[PDB]
Amino acid sequence: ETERTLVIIKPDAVVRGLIGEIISRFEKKGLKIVGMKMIWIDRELAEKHYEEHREKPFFKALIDYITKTPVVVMVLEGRYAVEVVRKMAGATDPKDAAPGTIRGDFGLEVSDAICNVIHASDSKESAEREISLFFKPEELFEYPRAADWFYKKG
Amino acid sequence: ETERTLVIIKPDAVVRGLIGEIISRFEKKGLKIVGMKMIWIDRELAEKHYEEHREKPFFKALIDYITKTPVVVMVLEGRYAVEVVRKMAGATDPKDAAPGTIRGDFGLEVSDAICNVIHASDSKESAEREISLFFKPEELFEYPRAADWFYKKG
Amino acid sequence: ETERTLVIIKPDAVVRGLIGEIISRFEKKGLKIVGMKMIWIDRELAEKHYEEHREKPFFKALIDYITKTPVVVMVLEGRYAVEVVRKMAGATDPKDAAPGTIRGDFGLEVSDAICNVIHASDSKESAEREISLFFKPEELFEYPRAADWFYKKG
Amino acid sequence: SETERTLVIIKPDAVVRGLIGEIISRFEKKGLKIVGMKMIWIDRELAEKHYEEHREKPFFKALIDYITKTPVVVMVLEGRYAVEVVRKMAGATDPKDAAPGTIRGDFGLEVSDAICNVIHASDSKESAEREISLFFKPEELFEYPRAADWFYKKGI
Amino acid sequence: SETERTLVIIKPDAVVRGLIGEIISRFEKKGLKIVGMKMIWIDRELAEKHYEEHREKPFFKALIDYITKTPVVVMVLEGRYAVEVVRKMAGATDPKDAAPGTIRGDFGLEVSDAICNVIHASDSKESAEREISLFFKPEELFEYPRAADWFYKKGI
Amino acid sequence: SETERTLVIIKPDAVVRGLIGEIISRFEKKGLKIVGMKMIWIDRELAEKHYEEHREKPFFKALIDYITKTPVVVMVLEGRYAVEVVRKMAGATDPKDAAPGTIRGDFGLEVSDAICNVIHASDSKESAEREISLFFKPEELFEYPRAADWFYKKGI
Ligand SMILES: Nc1nc2c(ncn2[C@@H]2O[C@H](COP(=O)(O)OP(=O)(O)O)[C@@H](O)[C@H]2O)c(=O)[nH]1
Ligand SMILES: Nc1nc2c(ncn2[C@@H]2O[C@H](COP(=O)(O)OP(=O)(O)O)[C@@H](O)[C@H]2O)c(=O)[nH]1
Ligand SMILES: Nc1nc2c(ncn2[C@@H]2O[C@H](COP(=O)(O)OP(=O)(O)O)[C@@H](O)[C@H]2O)c(=O)[nH]1
Ligand SMILES: [Cl-]
Ligand SMILES: [Cl-]
Ligand SMILES: [Cl-]
Ligand SMILES: [Cl-]
Ligand SMILES: [Cl-]
Ligand SMILES: [Cl-]
Ligand SMILES: [Cl-]
Ligand SMILES: [Cl-]
Ligand SMILES: [Cl-]
Ligand SMILES: [Cl-]
Ligand SMILES: [Cl-]
Ligand SMILES: [Cl-]
Ligand SMILES: [Mg+2]
Ligand SMILES: [Mg+2]
Ligand SMILES: [Mg+2]
């Protein structure tokens, strides 16, 4: 049931100084950070990441948004991590996101793009693809978090 | 899409020392405080604010409640601020409010009135009316919050 | 409307150092701690507490889980405390729990048992029974919390 | 008695950065009572009056520009030895020197031509009295019970 | 070894104000282990025994009234040099003098006839030993692993 | 100018305990800018190079074992007098001595054969320069605006 998912702490979150608060929510949930780095995405990489939206009217604005400033890309590992992180993220448009979710508590204002604090892979398949776009195997680690032993079935 | 809504941090919140925590939730969401002051509402002003409830059985108790101690009235500005703040507030009766919402996390106990931490305008129209009841134009301001520039479409 | 409910801060929460954070959520909601103690539940007591699950496939694992390390048993008092605490706890399986709830924010990983941070009585009847299992009348108290006077109808 | 009132100004840097709530919560958590509060936009005349004791100091101009840059939140805190206590909570004038745990220590660092330091706290009972009068009318200050006030009642 | 056990009492003011959780979290976050804990309502005999060293001091009576005002939460914290560490976390006896960041510094200020100061922390290993015995039976103290205990294992 | 860059390492104890976010938030809240950051697993060669000044010290071996125990998060913080400021935020080397409010003061205590102390902070501008180079390539460090940067613009 253990899966890996890719999360991008977007430019709006970085500029607003919310990196730590976002990371803490994942750590507190029990999710493990197995990879992470601050990078500045270029248009080519951005369009590959968001290839599914190439023919949508907001594509250009979305690429401008994700490449506006550096972002923090990270890989989270844990039981059903993909669906869990999507649940934690909340609705795409922050105004519709429920209080308690990341977008619900931190997002609201938008530009030409629907600024929404973070990106979260939408499926195990997508996560695999996205993780490969931003990380090399040598940047992903296997190590124990403090409470790992507690759940070991002997 | 930018709107203004009126919020009243009720006597129960003031007495319990929750003013700051409530304000922080709005600031963290990205909402801008364009007006704010601690006042002690008298019955006349209270009945004008809650005119819609004049013929309800809980009217008297509600007026007693809102005028019990000083309150903090404030105007919040932001994208769809009215519906967003209502969403953040949660169900009228705190016991029914979802965890994560203001009433959900802070409210529960009631008196003869359903004490519920805060008041939030229910519509743009109501907000306009309520804002006018408590504030003069000279008490409302236009200024930039730190991240405002980020969302400017050039 | 004032009720008492039993909550058990389970071994996973104790080991992870989440006792305080869990307690704070209840205090902030307005709930009153009328009884509380750290104990180490033995199998006999554990099976009495979870008697309803005796014929379920996960029974053995559940008993192992709840008796793994000491836990903190506590009695919470307040308006509709039973349903309110259940609401605050969230879905049984933490991966399904909504962000904002205790299980939603803190739980995810599981062992042979569905580790979910806390236990909360499912009804007033169950609460009565469970409270009696862990506490003697002399361990339960009646005292005023700071804001109690605020809600007194004269 | 030991109960005093002091003036706090949540400065433009704090307002712009969205720290109003976090600052207020620190005072509420300490047990201090907010007896008056409002968001205002200080004009140069009022700013220079508040900081008149620095009228003949080199940093005066930058200070006025800073305090009047955007709206601020002025408030009056009441409580046991509130003046010295709030000053202690504020921390060293230059935030880089302020101890972690203090308001300036946890939230301040960067400066403009002025030493931006998150908040203002009256330095003495005499200054508190003068400052409260500059920003608040008696009609804007209130006497009411905070939840735990009854717990501290002395004598019988 | 360096591992010690100390006694902490979350006093009536903290309980009434709903600060039990916040106080416990500070100890958990520090890495201290809670090996015993319970809510009890201290009677005068036990209160006077705990504070026997102040038996002949003017504030004694007010102190007993205060500590027995409502139920409290007594707990035993275990960890490296726990006695001095918890004392440091507590801060100065009179909360108005306690540094921001400490428990008394962030949460205490107001007083009654007694100097209400949020919590009690054993002042020495000798006092800790005596105090733990007054409130806890060995059967109420436990040895178990906290999540990160394995990380600190020494030697091979 | 007064703007400096310093190197911070969120050590294995912090990573294992899930404190990465809380530590980063303290720097963000202070107003410091993260210009570089990544999770890496330090090897003995790099660890010994970073701590070369302790090459001939008794605790060296335990120190290397500790810093290479699990992955860490290295990051570069930029801001006014960042070196001394971050050091101040970190607190005393041995967490038991660190003041409440500091990172080590609030989060550290227990030790292994090494004095586990949550994070590493460059001790000087010279050390910061050397350390940043050991862990980061210029291509991994960025210049960008944080939300409030405009507020502090000096002069006209
Ligand atoms: N301007 C604009 N941007 C959008 C819209 N929908 C989505 N976006 C942006 O494009 C991103 C990706 O879209 P999508 O995958 O559908 O949403 P997500 O998976 O929840 O992030 C969203 O997170 C927004 O940043 C839209 O309708 N208009
Ligand atoms: N006693 C009592 N008070 C109520 C009841 N419904 C609402 N109230 C109080 O009256 C306030 C205004 O009512 P309403 O506008 O319907 O709810 P709101 O807009 O969510 O605050 C509520 O916030 C409560 O303070 C009720 O059924 N009984
Ligand atoms: N292994 C396993 N454990 C379960 C399952 N369902 C429940 N549990 C565990 O048994 C406890 C009690 O079950 P139940 O009363 O139905 O859920 P609760 O009232 O929400 O705690 C749950 O909290 C879990 O700890 C399950 O389907 N499989
Ligand atoms: Cl949502
Ligand atoms: Cl963990
Ligand atoms: Cl709701
Ligand atoms: Cl902002
Ligand atoms: Cl749920
Ligand atoms: Cl209360
Ligand atoms: Cl200081
Ligand atoms: Cl209070
Ligand atoms: Cl101190
Ligand atoms: Cl731990
Ligand atoms: Cl220190
Ligand atoms: Cl910023
Ligand atoms: Mg998507
Ligand atoms: Mg209404
Ligand atoms: Mg059940």
CSV table of N, CA and C in Angstrom, one decimal, chain C residues 5-91:
chain,number,residue,atom,x,y,z
C,5,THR,N,-17.8,11.8,27.7
C,5,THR,CA,-17.4,10.7,26.8
C,5,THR,C,-16.0,10.3,27.1
C,6,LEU,N,-15.7,9.1,26.8
C,6,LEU,CA,-14.3,8.6,27.1
C,6,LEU,C,-13.4,8.6,25.8
C,7,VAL,N,-12.2,9.1,26.0
C,7,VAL,CA,-11.3,9.1,24.9
C,7,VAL,C,-10.0,8.4,25.4
C,8,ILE,N,-9.4,7.6,24.5
C,8,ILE,CA,-8.2,7.0,24.8
C,8,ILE,C,-7.1,7.5,23.8
C,9,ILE,N,-6.1,8.0,24.2
C,9,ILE,CA,-5.0,8.5,23.4
C,9,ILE,C,-4.2,7.2,23.2
C,10,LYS,N,-4.3,6.6,22.1
C,10,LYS,CA,-3.7,5.3,21.8
C,10,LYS,C,-2.1,5.2,21.7
C,11,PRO,N,-1.5,4.0,21.8
C,11,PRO,CA,-0.1,3.9,21.8
C,11,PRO,C,0.6,4.6,20.7
C,12,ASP,N,0.1,4.6,19.5
C,12,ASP,CA,0.8,5.3,18.4
C,12,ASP,C,0.9,6.8,18.7
C,13,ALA,N,-0.1,7.4,19.3
C,13,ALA,CA,-0.1,8.8,19.6
C,13,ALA,C,0.9,9.1,20.8
C,14,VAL,N,0.9,8.2,21.8
C,14,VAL,CA,1.8,8.4,22.9
C,14,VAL,C,3.3,8.3,22.4
C,15,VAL,N,3.6,7.2,21.7
C,15,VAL,CA,4.9,7.0,21.2
C,15,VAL,C,5.4,8.2,20.3
C,16,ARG,N,4.5,8.7,19.5
C,16,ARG,CA,4.8,9.8,18.6
C,16,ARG,C,4.8,11.2,19.3
C,17,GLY,N,4.5,11.2,20.6
C,17,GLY,CA,4.5,12.5,21.3
C,17,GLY,C,3.4,13.5,20.9
C,18,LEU,N,2.2,13.0,20.7
C,18,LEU,CA,1.1,13.8,20.3
C,18,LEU,C,0.1,14.0,21.4
C,19,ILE,N,0.4,13.6,22.6
C,19,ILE,CA,-0.6,13.7,23.7
C,19,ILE,C,-1.1,15.1,23.9
C,20,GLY,N,-0.1,16.1,24.0
C,20,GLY,CA,-0.5,17.5,24.2
C,20,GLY,C,-1.3,18.1,23.1
C,21,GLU,N,-0.9,17.8,21.8
C,21,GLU,CA,-1.7,18.4,20.7
C,21,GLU,C,-3.1,17.9,20.6
C,22,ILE,N,-3.3,16.6,21.0
C,22,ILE,CA,-4.7,16.0,21.0
C,22,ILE,C,-5.5,16.7,22.1
C,23,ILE,N,-4.9,16.8,23.3
C,23,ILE,CA,-5.6,17.4,24.4
C,23,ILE,C,-6.0,18.8,24.1
C,24,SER,N,-5.0,19.6,23.5
C,24,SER,CA,-5.3,21.0,23.2
C,24,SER,C,-6.5,21.2,22.3
C,25,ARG,N,-6.7,20.3,21.3
C,25,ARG,CA,-7.8,20.4,20.4
C,25,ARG,C,-9.2,20.3,21.2
C,26,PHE,N,-9.2,19.5,22.2
C,26,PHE,CA,-10.4,19.4,23.0
C,26,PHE,C,-10.6,20.6,23.9
C,27,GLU,N,-9.5,21.1,24.5
C,27,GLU,CA,-9.6,22.3,25.4
C,27,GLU,C,-10.0,23.5,24.6
C,28,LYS,N,-9.5,23.6,23.4
C,28,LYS,CA,-9.8,24.8,22.5
C,28,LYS,C,-11.2,24.8,22.0
C,29,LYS,N,-11.8,23.6,21.9
C,29,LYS,CA,-13.2,23.4,21.5
C,29,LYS,C,-14.1,23.9,22.6
C,30,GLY,N,-13.6,23.9,23.8
C,30,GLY,CA,-14.4,24.2,25.0
C,30,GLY,C,-14.8,23.1,25.9
C,31,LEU,N,-14.3,21.9,25.5
C,31,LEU,CA,-14.6,20.7,26.3
C,31,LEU,C,-13.8,20.7,27.6
C,32,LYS,N,-14.3,20.1,28.6
C,32,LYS,CA,-13.7,20.0,29.9
C,32,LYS,C,-13.1,18.7,30.3
C,33,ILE,N,-11.9,18.6,30.7
C,33,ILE,CA,-11.3,17.3,31.1
C,33,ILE,C,-11.7,17.1,32.5
C,34,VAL,N,-12.5,16.1,32.8
C,34,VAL,CA,-13.0,15.9,34.2
C,34,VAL,C,-12.3,14.7,34.8
C,35,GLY,N,-11.5,14.0,33.9
C,35,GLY,CA,-10.8,12.8,34.4
C,35,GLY,C,-9.7,12.5,33.4
C,36,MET,N,-8.5,12.0,33.9
C,36,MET,CA,-7.4,11.7,33.1
C,36,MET,C,-6.3,11.0,33.8
C,37,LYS,N,-5.7,10.0,33.1
C,37,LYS,CA,-4.5,9.3,33.7
C,37,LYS,C,-3.8,8.4,32.6
C,38,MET,N,-2.5,8.3,32.8
C,38,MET,CA,-1.8,7.4,31.9
C,38,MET,C,-1.8,6.1,32.6
C,39,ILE,N,-2.1,5.0,31.8
C,39,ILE,CA,-2.2,3.7,32.3
C,39,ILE,C,-1.6,2.7,31.3
C,40,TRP,N,-1.4,1.5,31.7
C,40,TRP,CA,-1.0,0.5,30.7
C,40,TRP,C,-2.0,-0.6,30.7
C,41,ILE,N,-2.9,-0.6,29.7
C,41,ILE,CA,-4.0,-1.6,29.6
C,41,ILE,C,-3.5,-3.0,29.4
C,42,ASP,N,-4.0,-4.0,30.2
C,42,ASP,CA,-3.7,-5.4,30.0
C,42,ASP,C,-4.7,-6.0,29.0
C,43,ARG,N,-4.4,-7.2,28.6
C,43,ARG,CA,-5.3,-7.8,27.6
C,43,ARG,C,-6.7,-8.0,28.1
C,44,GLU,N,-6.9,-8.4,29.4
C,44,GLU,CA,-8.2,-8.6,30.0
C,44,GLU,C,-9.1,-7.3,29.9
C,45,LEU,N,-8.5,-6.2,30.3
C,45,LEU,CA,-9.2,-4.9,30.3
C,45,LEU,C,-9.5,-4.5,28.8
C,46,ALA,N,-8.5,-4.7,28.0
C,46,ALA,CA,-8.6,-4.4,26.6
C,46,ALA,C,-9.7,-5.1,25.9
C,47,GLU,N,-9.9,-6.4,26.2
C,47,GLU,CA,-10.9,-7.2,25.6
C,47,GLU,C,-12.3,-6.8,26.1
C,48,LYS,N,-12.3,-6.3,27.3
C,48,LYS,CA,-13.6,-5.8,27.9
C,48,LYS,C,-14.0,-4.5,27.2
C,49,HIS,N,-13.0,-3.6,27.0
C,49,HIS,CA,-13.3,-2.4,26.3
C,49,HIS,C,-13.8,-2.6,24.9
C,50,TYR,N,-13.1,-3.5,24.2
C,50,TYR,CA,-13.5,-3.8,22.8
C,50,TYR,C,-14.3,-5.1,22.6
C,51,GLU,N,-15.1,-5.4,23.6
C,51,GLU,CA,-15.9,-6.6,23.6
C,51,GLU,C,-16.8,-6.8,22.3
C,52,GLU,N,-17.2,-5.7,21.7
C,52,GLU,CA,-18.0,-5.7,20.5
C,52,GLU,C,-17.3,-6.3,19.3
C,53,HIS,N,-16.0,-6.3,19.3
C,53,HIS,CA,-15.2,-6.7,18.2
C,53,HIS,C,-14.6,-8.2,18.4
C,54,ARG,N,-15.0,-8.8,19.4
C,54,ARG,CA,-14.5,-10.2,19.7
C,54,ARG,C,-14.5,-11.2,18.6
C,55,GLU,N,-15.5,-11.1,17.8
C,55,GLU,CA,-15.6,-12.1,16.7
C,55,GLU,C,-15.2,-11.6,15.3
C,56,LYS,N,-14.5,-10.4,15.3
C,56,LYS,CA,-14.0,-9.9,14.1
C,56,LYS,C,-12.6,-10.3,13.8
C,57,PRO,N,-12.2,-10.5,12.5
C,57,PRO,CA,-10.8,-10.9,12.2
C,57,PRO,C,-9.6,-10.1,12.7
C,58,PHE,N,-9.9,-8.8,13.0
C,58,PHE,CA,-8.9,-7.9,13.5
C,58,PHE,C,-8.8,-7.8,15.0
C,59,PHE,N,-9.6,-8.6,15.7
C,59,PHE,CA,-9.6,-8.5,17.2
C,59,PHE,C,-8.3,-8.7,17.8
C,60,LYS,N,-7.6,-9.8,17.6
C,60,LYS,CA,-6.3,-10.0,18.2
C,60,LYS,C,-5.3,-8.9,17.9
C,61,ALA,N,-5.2,-8.4,16.7
C,61,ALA,CA,-4.3,-7.3,16.3
C,61,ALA,C,-4.7,-6.0,17.1
C,62,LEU,N,-6.0,-5.8,17.3
C,62,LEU,CA,-6.5,-4.6,18.0
C,62,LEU,C,-6.1,-4.7,19.5
C,63,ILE,N,-6.2,-5.8,20.1
C,63,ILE,CA,-5.8,-6.0,21.5
C,63,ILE,C,-4.3,-5.7,21.6
C,64,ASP,N,-3.5,-6.3,20.7
C,64,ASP,CA,-2.1,-6.1,20.7
C,64,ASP,C,-1.7,-4.6,20.6
C,65,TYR,N,-2.4,-3.9,19.7
C,65,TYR,CA,-2.2,-2.5,19.5
C,65,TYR,C,-2.5,-1.7,20.7
C,66,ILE,N,-3.7,-1.8,21.3
C,66,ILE,CA,-4.1,-1.0,22.4
C,66,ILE,C,-3.3,-1.3,23.7
C,67,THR,N,-2.6,-2.4,23.8
C,67,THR,CA,-1.8,-2.8,24.9
C,67,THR,C,-0.3,-2.7,24.7
C,68,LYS,N,0.0,-2.2,23.5
C,68,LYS,CA,1.4,-2.1,23.1
C,68,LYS,C,2.3,-1.2,24.0
C,69,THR,N,1.8,-0.1,24.4
C,69,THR,CA,2.5,0.8,25.3
C,69,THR,C,1.5,1.5,26.2
C,70,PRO,N,1.9,2.4,27.1
C,70,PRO,CA,0.9,3.0,28.0
C,70,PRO,C,0.0,3.9,27.1
C,71,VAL,N,-1.2,4.3,27.6
C,71,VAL,CA,-2.1,5.1,26.8
C,71,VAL,C,-2.6,6.2,27.8
C,72,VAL,N,-3.3,7.2,27.4
C,72,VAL,CA,-3.8,8.2,28.3
C,72,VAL,C,-5.3,8.1,28.1
C,73,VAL,N,-6.0,7.7,29.2
C,73,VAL,CA,-7.5,7.6,29.1
C,73,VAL,C,-8.0,8.9,29.8
C,74,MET,N,-9.0,9.5,29.2
C,74,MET,CA,-9.5,10.7,29.7
C,74,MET,C,-11.0,10.9,29.5
C,75,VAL,N,-11.7,11.6,30.4
C,75,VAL,CA,-13.1,11.8,30.2
C,75,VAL,C,-13.3,13.3,29.9
C,76,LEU,N,-14.1,13.5,28.8
C,76,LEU,CA,-14.4,14.9,28.4
C,76,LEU,C,-15.8,15.2,28.6
C,77,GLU,N,-16.1,16.4,29.1
C,77,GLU,CA,-17.5,16.8,29.4
C,77,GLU,C,-17.8,18.1,28.7
C,78,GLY,N,-19.1,18.1,28.2
C,78,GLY,CA,-19.5,19.3,27.4
C,78,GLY,C,-20.8,19.0,26.7
C,79,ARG,N,-21.3,20.1,26.1
C,79,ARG,CA,-22.5,20.0,25.3
C,79,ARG,C,-22.4,19.0,24.2
C,80,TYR,N,-23.2,18.0,24.2
C,80,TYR,CA,-23.2,16.9,23.2
C,80,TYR,C,-21.8,16.4,23.0
C,81,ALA,N,-21.0,16.2,24.0
C,81,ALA,CA,-19.7,15.8,24.0
C,81,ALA,C,-19.4,14.5,23.1
C,82,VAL,N,-20.3,13.5,23.3
C,82,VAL,CA,-20.2,12.3,22.5
C,82,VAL,C,-20.1,12.4,21.0
C,83,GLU,N,-21.1,13.0,20.4
C,83,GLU,CA,-21.1,13.2,19.0
C,83,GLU,C,-20.0,14.2,18.5
C,84,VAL,N,-19.8,15.2,19.3
C,84,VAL,CA,-18.8,16.2,19.0
C,84,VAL,C,-17.4,15.6,18.9
C,85,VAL,N,-17.0,14.8,19.9
C,85,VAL,CA,-15.7,14.2,19.9
C,85,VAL,C,-15.6,13.2,18.8
C,86,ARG,N,-16.7,12.5,18.4
C,86,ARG,CA,-16.6,11.5,17.3
C,86,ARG,C,-16.3,12.3,16.0
C,87,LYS,N,-17.0,13.5,15.9
C,87,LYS,CA,-16.8,14.3,14.7
C,87,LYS,C,-15.4,14.8,14.7
C,88,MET,N,-14.8,15.2,15.8
C,88,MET,CA,-13.5,15.7,15.9
C,88,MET,C,-12.5,14.6,15.5
C,89,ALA,N,-12.8,13.4,15.9
C,89,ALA,CA,-11.9,12.3,15.7
C,89,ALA,C,-11.7,12.0,14.2
C,90,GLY,N,-12.9,11.9,13.5
C,90,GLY,CA,-12.8,11.6,12.1
C,90,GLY,C,-13.0,10.1,11.8
C,91,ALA,N,-13.0,9.8,10.5
C,91,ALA,CA,-13.1,8.4,10.0
C,91,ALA,C,-12.2,7.4,10.7
